[PDB]
Design an enzyme around this catalytic site. Sequence first.
Site, short mmCIF file in Angstrom:
data_model
loop_
_atom_site.label_atom_id
_atom_site.label_comp_id
_atom_site.label_asym_id
_atom_site.label_seq_id
_atom_site.Cartn_x
_atom_site.Cartn_y
_atom_site.Cartn_z
N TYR A 19 -24.22 -63.61 -8.57
CA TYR A 19 -23.07 -64.53 -8.66
C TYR A 19 -23.65 -65.36 -9.33
O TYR A 19 -24.98 -66.02 -8.97
CB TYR A 19 -21.56 -65.07 -7.66
N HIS A 77 12.63 -23.63 31.06
CA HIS A 77 11.34 -23.18 31.12
C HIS A 77 11.45 -21.97 30.49
O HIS A 77 11.53 -21.15 31.39
CB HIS A 77 10.55 -23.58 32.37
N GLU A 94 -10.99 -37.75 31.80
CA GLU A 94 -10.29 -36.67 30.59
C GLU A 94 -10.29 -37.47 29.48
O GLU A 94 -10.22 -38.49 29.24
CB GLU A 94 -8.62 -37.64 30.77
N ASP A 126 -11.27 -41.63 32.13
CA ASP A 126 -9.96 -42.15 31.01
C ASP A 126 -11.60 -42.51 29.70
O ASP A 126 -12.23 -43.35 29.16
CB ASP A 126 -9.05 -43.20 31.18
#
Length: 830
Positions: free
Chosen positions: A566, A344, A264, A10
Amino acid sequence: MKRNYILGLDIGITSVGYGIIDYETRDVIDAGVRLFKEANVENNEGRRSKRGARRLKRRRRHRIQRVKKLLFDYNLLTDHSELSGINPYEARVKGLSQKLSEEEFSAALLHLAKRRGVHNVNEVEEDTGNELSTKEQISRNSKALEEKYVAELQLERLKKDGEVRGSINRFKTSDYVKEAKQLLKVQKAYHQLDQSFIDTYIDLLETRRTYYEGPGEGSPKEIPTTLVDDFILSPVVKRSFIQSIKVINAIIKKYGLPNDIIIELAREKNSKDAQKMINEMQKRNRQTNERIEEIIRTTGKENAKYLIEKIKLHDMQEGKCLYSLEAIPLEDLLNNPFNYEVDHIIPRSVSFDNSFNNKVLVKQEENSKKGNRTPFQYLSSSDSKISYETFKKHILNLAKGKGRISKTKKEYLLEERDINRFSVQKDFINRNLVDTRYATRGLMNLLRSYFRVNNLDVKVKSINGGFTSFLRRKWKFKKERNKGYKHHAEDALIIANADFIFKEWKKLDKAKKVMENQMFIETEQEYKEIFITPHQIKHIKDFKDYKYSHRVDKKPNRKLINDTLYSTRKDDKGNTRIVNNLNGLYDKDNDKLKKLINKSPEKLLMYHHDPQTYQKLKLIMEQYGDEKNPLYKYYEETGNYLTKYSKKDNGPVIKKIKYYGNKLNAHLDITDDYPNSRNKVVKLSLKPYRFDVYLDNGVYKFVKVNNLDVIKKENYYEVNSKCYEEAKKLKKISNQAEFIASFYRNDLIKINGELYRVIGVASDLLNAIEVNMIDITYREYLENMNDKRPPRIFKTISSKTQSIKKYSTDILGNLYEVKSKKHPQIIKKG
RNA sequence: AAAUUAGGUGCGCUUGGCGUUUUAGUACUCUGGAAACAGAAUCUACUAAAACAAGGCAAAAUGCCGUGUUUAUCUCGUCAACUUGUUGGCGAGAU
DNA sequence: ATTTGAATAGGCAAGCCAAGCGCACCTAATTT
DNA sequence: CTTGCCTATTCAAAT
């Protein structure tokens, strides 16, 4: 080892899941996750943009210095010349008529070269009151300069509006050259300067490099990862494909060559795109939910919550059966749901598509008659109540205008091709089973090429992002990030079991072959039986021994510190403090100053230094106390910004207010860039490289090594020795103290027997280190608990600390207690 | 597979106004003075000059580099590197 | 019996945006 | 959005 297996993968934006399963039995062998930081395009875009900025500033500085040298050569400037109190706007406007002094003349030429306009902007001749538009500003200014020079217009604003610099200060270089030529025409008389001077100076002023010139002289066994670099990808995807390949190489080395790989690639491209889609989806879901709520409010029928899909289809279809075009009354649907069935459009047995786009709400009788036929085949048969032509017209009407059908659904409804043709089935399979994206194709071509060449019988495949989710719904296995990173791995194991289903069922042989790119089901119940619960999902779900492998960054010369500068000040108590600034004083919803005055009036510098202006501001805050921003009302009611106190009402506007902020500890001091600075000039956020733990007479101690402490040499970086010995001294680490380990970002650390991953050093001074959990982010660990602590772990290293050990994982997530060298690293060649 | 039109993704380059900060000047405040002006204060504003990832080269030059990518650990062998005993490549082992 | 120091909770802030160029590869539509 | 780091609050140990 001997045993044969499948490899699920995956692939994700931040993760590569992997799963390994016995080819015969389909028992889990192994499973894990490899986690990394998303490769954001922002990062390199940053690096490039800053490289651009550095060159712009270098080139300005070098242009100013080339002008100076020309003024030295023609003896207009010396080491001991006073240029200090010479207003160049006055000197520019004066020198277009009268003689300048050598100093005024030098002041003027230097002012021109510093700031010399754009060269590549053509007139738009339009004005839509856009301040930030260069084109609109350049044009507005071009109109202003019809009769006058840039310095004339600039001196006019200095006197009228009190100021010159800003957004309106955007002029064409040609407008500046027109001025310089005139200045040098007048001044040529009175100063000794020749056409060589004039030619040289205007070149400096106008000239710049082109895009096609660019910089000056000096400027710069197993599956390989170089093939990913060949074919162009998104950085986010490019990182994952390199990670994936190294995870495949590690599995092959350990377990031997897989029989089947199946991959995937995640839907989303980056986290932001995903969030947008999720938001869009949620937006869509809210609408459906609101309708369901309305139905329940109006009808009192609670069963509506179980008919979400049917109701969605009903609304989509204008409450009609698409096959008969007869009405499906919402009330009847709610009372007698069994009279209506979800059909379907394209038989699932052919398309393998269970998506909403392939679903329609129909009467039970019509569904029975259609069977495993397309609408075209059915409506062309003797069994249909209506003609296909009538149906087609209706669908086309539904597709145009309000209550629209998706393109895909329309195409399915109007599919006229012979379902039984292999080419047509192939098309459906490719759409539903085989992933069709340039990256996914690119990856499997890389892999298939590799195995083919080296003669290794490995069947690379892919499955569609959607498909995994279907099996999760089918086998009752709820996806949730909640649980931890394991979800990525338990996705992989599912993918790997789909492969088993696409090998053991001879009826899926066609689909299998399509997925393997190799050269060349009668009933709904049969289709459903093929995919039924195996038992092996109990193995997947009850499995425990997952493995995690977070990637460790050791790169030197990353961002060293924050950009901002600063100033500092010593307060009454003699504590150096950062100076802050309140901006945006006259904004509707800004309570910063009103909060500050009520809490801490003594934090304002004007409290001490301009008491009269302070008392004048306090009367406003008291006047319009009730609102968020008293000054907003002051601006709204009277129509005048707050001015400094003055006896004759001629003090300037107040636009920012300085006040004392945090105490100064950990900083970088840049004060030597500012000669004769009274106070100290600093930068903040020293960004860490690593920390080195020492065991000193039974006491654990550590040094932070900053990225500032690491310095590039010829071909290597070096940790600075002086900075390092100084650091040990502030930590009171003895010369007889044993070095234990060095911890980089995501290095693994076991503190008092508890394993974590390192984030950084929260506080060098207090001896705290920020860590995270391994299997889950601590944020999510607290959410699943419903705890409302801060979601950050900090660990103090002290006389109380009992053991510190370093651990390490391989890419697969196998965990090892690791050894260290006798001394810290100083050289880093990589 | 090519052409045309429209968009995208990425690498790279060339510029501009700003923004942050310091020093100075001027205005604002205070004190003294008939006034010019001198001193005090360093707060609010404008203008100039300078610095802006720490730094490193280079040497009159449209001068150059510095925030990306690749990156589990340790031992042994080997080749190399410059830092001359370390840390890179390759191979083998262990964790 | 009260004061001083450690640990945990709470919270703030982080340089910007407009003009131009090249090259690379992808997608979509249309024709061959 | 995450991280470097300061401030403020609460509880236990020492004078």
